[PDB]
Amino acid sequence: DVTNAEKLVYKYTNIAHSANPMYEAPSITDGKIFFNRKFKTPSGKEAACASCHTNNPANVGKNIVTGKEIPPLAPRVNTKRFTDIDKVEDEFTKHCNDILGADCSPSEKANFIAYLLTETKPTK
């Protein structure tokens, strides 16, 4: 839910600030850029988080590999997101590894979850 998501932003901010002292607080601008940024897959094809989750994380997504819909990421819209707090940190680490080849950094996670807190309305 939103409660657990918000608490994770503080957790990852404090980890990030220890590792990278110039980082002090989340940037929702940077979280949004991270979500939409086209990165290069090994093949040379570009992809972004938004390729599967759409450019609005309040919307239902679609996996470009399998065609399967994906529930929204924004926890105000899909309140199940982040409720499974014993597992969701490990699951996010696994997912970053799957999509990008390595875990997302603590500042990337703080910025991204803070951005998710701000996306409360689906695109119509």
Ligand code: HEC
């Ligand atoms: C399609 C190939 C995807 C791309 C590119 C990214 N994600 Fe994804 N994401 C995808 C699926 C099929 C799933 C699992 C199904 C589900 O409903 O959870 C997810 C899930 C997430 C989650 C939720 C994790 C959890 O609650 O356990 C998050 C926060 C998430 N995805 C974020 C995310 C980011 C930041 C991405 C770019 C680095 C990204 N995803 C890419 C499919 C795909």
